[PDB]
Scaffold this motif. Structure first.
Motif, PDB file in Angstrom:
ATOM      1  N   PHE A  72       9.993   4.158  -0.936  1.00  0.00           N
ATOM      2  CA  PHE A  72      10.233   5.056  -0.055  1.00  0.00           C
ATOM      3  C   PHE A  72      11.561   5.274   0.474  1.00  0.00           C
ATOM      4  O   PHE A  72      12.414   4.238   0.407  1.00  0.00           O
ATOM      5  N   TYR A 119       6.946  13.241   0.729  1.00  0.00           N
ATOM      6  CA  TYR A 119       5.723  12.647   1.343  1.00  0.00           C
ATOM      7  C   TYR A 119       5.597  12.939   2.641  1.00  0.00           C
ATOM      8  O   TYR A 119       4.567  13.171   3.257  1.00  0.00           O
ATOM      9  N   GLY A 148       9.090  -0.195   0.820  1.00  0.00           N
ATOM     10  CA  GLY A 148       7.887  -0.082  -0.268  1.00  0.00           C
ATOM     11  C   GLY A 148       6.748  -0.695   0.459  1.00  0.00           C
ATOM     12  O   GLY A 148       6.857  -1.567   1.130  1.00  0.00           O
ATOM     13  N   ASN A 149       5.591  -0.601  -0.498  1.00  0.00           N
ATOM     14  CA  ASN A 149       4.393  -1.364  -0.190  1.00  0.00           C
ATOM     15  C   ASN A 149       3.847  -1.937  -1.414  1.00  0.00           C
ATOM     16  O   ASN A 149       2.760  -2.406  -1.502  1.00  0.00           O
ATOM     17  N   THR A 198       8.313  12.727  -4.660  1.00  0.00           N
ATOM     18  CA  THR A 198       7.333  13.397  -3.733  1.00  0.00           C
ATOM     19  C   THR A 198       7.907  13.400  -2.456  1.00  0.00           C
ATOM     20  O   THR A 198       8.418  12.783  -1.759  1.00  0.00           O
ATOM     21  N   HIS A 238      17.000   4.554  -0.198  1.00  0.00           N
ATOM     22  CA  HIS A 238      15.841   3.479  -0.174  1.00  0.00           C
ATOM     23  C   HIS A 238      15.791   2.771   1.143  1.00  0.00           C
ATOM     24  O   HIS A 238      16.830   2.294   1.548  1.00  0.00           O
ATOM     25  N   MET A 248       8.871   9.864  -1.632  1.00  0.00           N
ATOM     26  CA  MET A 248       8.205   8.632  -2.233  1.00  0.00           C
ATOM     27  C   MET A 248       8.365   8.704  -3.950  1.00  0.00           C
ATOM     28  O   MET A 248       8.171   9.723  -4.389  1.00  0.00           O
ATOM     29  N   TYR A 249       8.245   7.351  -4.544  1.00  0.00           N
ATOM     30  CA  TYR A 249       8.134   7.337  -5.981  1.00  0.00           C
ATOM     31  C   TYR A 249       7.464   5.967  -6.436  1.00  0.00           C
ATOM     32  O   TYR A 249       7.177   5.263  -5.775  1.00  0.00           O
ATOM     33  N   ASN A 250       6.915   6.051  -7.592  1.00  0.00           N
ATOM     34  CA  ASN A 250       5.943   5.202  -8.106  1.00  0.00           C
ATOM     35  C   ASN A 250       6.501   4.173  -8.670  1.00  0.00           C
ATOM     36  O   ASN A 250       6.434   4.163  -9.965  1.00  0.00           O
ATOM     37  N   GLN A 263       4.535   1.678  -4.515  1.00  0.00           N
ATOM     38  CA  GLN A 263       5.502   2.691  -4.230  1.00  0.00           C
ATOM     39  C   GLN A 263       6.538   2.371  -3.305  1.00  0.00           C
ATOM     40  O   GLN A 263       6.709   1.302  -2.757  1.00  0.00           O
TER      41      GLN A 263
END
Length: 181
Positions: A171, A123, A165-166, A121, A162, A138-140, A169
């Motif tokens: 980022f 984002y 990340g959280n 995405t 890269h 963003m990627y899942n 996800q």
């Protein structure tokens, strides 16, 4: 395993080095000449280690957009004795979304690592470690410490690096052709 991993492997084999700063070991993408990229949180100084060779930094520029907002990309010129293959023709010209991306990492901890992250995405805005940041992809996928600097590709495009990340996800900072004229 398929043509996405084929393009990713070709980029990793010829266009990446292991960069070490005082903040750790990072995947570092070489783009052309002696010019490479790394996440700005690597805190590049006057000297960096490149595949464990002590290397003078000739220039380092932490990029910001024309809103004066962090992009989390640092462009580094390295005082090396060798050039990178020129891959600027694989860089997107515009901000976009993507299908079927791969994240590829190569460090002492994670050698020859490839992750199919799927849909990417555009984002945009992210509060990244407390810092307002633009042009985030963003990627899942639940990406971990050790993957910063990892290269994000699709077939025929190098689209980002890269940067965080959280836990659920991941980022990446966009790479654009315009950064490397």
């Amino acid at each position: 395993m398929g043509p996405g991993f084929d393009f990713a492997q070709a980029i990793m084999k010829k266009n990446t080095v292991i960069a070490r700063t005082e903040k750790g070991e990072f995947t570092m993408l070489g783009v052309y000449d002696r010019v490479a990229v790394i996440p700005t949180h690597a805190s590049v100084g006057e000297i960096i280690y490149i595949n464990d060779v002590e290397t003078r930094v000739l220039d380092a520029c932490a990029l910001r957009d024309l809103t004066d907002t962090n992009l989390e990309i640092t462009i580094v010129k390295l005082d090396r004795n060798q050039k990178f293959r020129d891959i600027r023709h694989f860089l997107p010209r515009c901000e976009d979304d993507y299908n079927d991306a791969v994240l590829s990492v190569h460090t002492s901890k994670f050698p020859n690592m490839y992750i199919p992250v799927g849909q990417v995405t555009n984002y945009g805005f992210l509060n990244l470690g407390g810092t307002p940041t633009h042009r985030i992809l963003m990627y899942n996928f639940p990406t971990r410490a050790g993957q910063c600097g990892g290269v994000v590709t699709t077939t025929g495009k190098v689209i980002g690096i890269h940067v965080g990340g959280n836990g659920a996800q991941g980022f990446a900072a966009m790479l654009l052709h315009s950064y490397f004229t």
